């Protein structure tokens with residue numbers, strides 16, 4: 632930008648491009664996101680403006696919002712690494728359980744806060760979870776489908792990741808609940824533990840069927856109303872639920888129990904972020920320092 636000297640391209644989010652940049656005037660280093668247009672919504676910007684007041688230690692701070700030339704710029708505080716990269720970097724040895732637990736706990740604190748302020752993330756994935764040398768982890772790139780909609784890609788031909796999508800979204804539910812974020816986080820928790828994506832679907836139906844093959848094809852017993860959902864087909868195959876001990880070995884029972892509650896099919900049975908924070912799994916939670924190579 633004009634007052635920003637773009638250092639590098641950080642990524643290409645589902646809405647636009649993200650750059651590492653320095654405020655030529657203040658010298659501060661930030662993450663600048665350019666949003667994908669002829670006029671730009673005046674209502675979505677109020678969804679944005681609302682996010683600026685959403686300040687929490689586990690939520691990436693939105694510093695400024697600038698609308699100019701059919702371009703929408705979001706200025707965020709900069710963090711040096713994302714969880715996807717850290718997970719890849721920790722693949723040989725695995726992220727130590729205490730750090731996994733710390734990250735999960737902080738993310739739940741962040742979501743409990745968002746949710747209590749009636750803000751949904753909608754697109755949690757490792758790439759959107761940022762970490763620093765201090766052991767903190769923060770929620771980034773909040774999805775604005777209620778202020779934009781679900782993009783076919785990101786803005787310019789880019790395969791959208793469905794791995795963390797809640798079943799109700801895949802089954803065509805039109806109104807997302809805070810439960811969608813808990814599902815995504817449960818999938819991420821599993822991935823940190825096993826070092827392999829839990830449900831790596833490559834299409835909406837493959838994603839749905841990967842979930843069904845592991846947790847069992849849902850029915851009216853475990854998910855009242857599921858058969859009346861928009862995209863539910865009576866013709867879906869009927870898979871039996873797999874033993875949960877086979878899904879995330881060698882996670883302890885406290886962890887498996889919490890994970891099971893985060894992955895309940897029924898959005899209403901799925902544990903809340905607030906309740907999850909009180910789960911026995913966190914009795915010995917601490918805040919370890921990660922080994923970050925920048």
Ligand SMILES: CC(C)Nc1nc(N)c(C(=O)c2cccnc2)s1
Nearest residue numbers: 644662707708709710712713771772
């Ligand atoms: C080097 C990267 C991990 N630094 C980033 N800092 C912030 N603040 C980012 C974002 O805020 C962000 C992440 C993913 C998609 N859109 C924005 S990325």
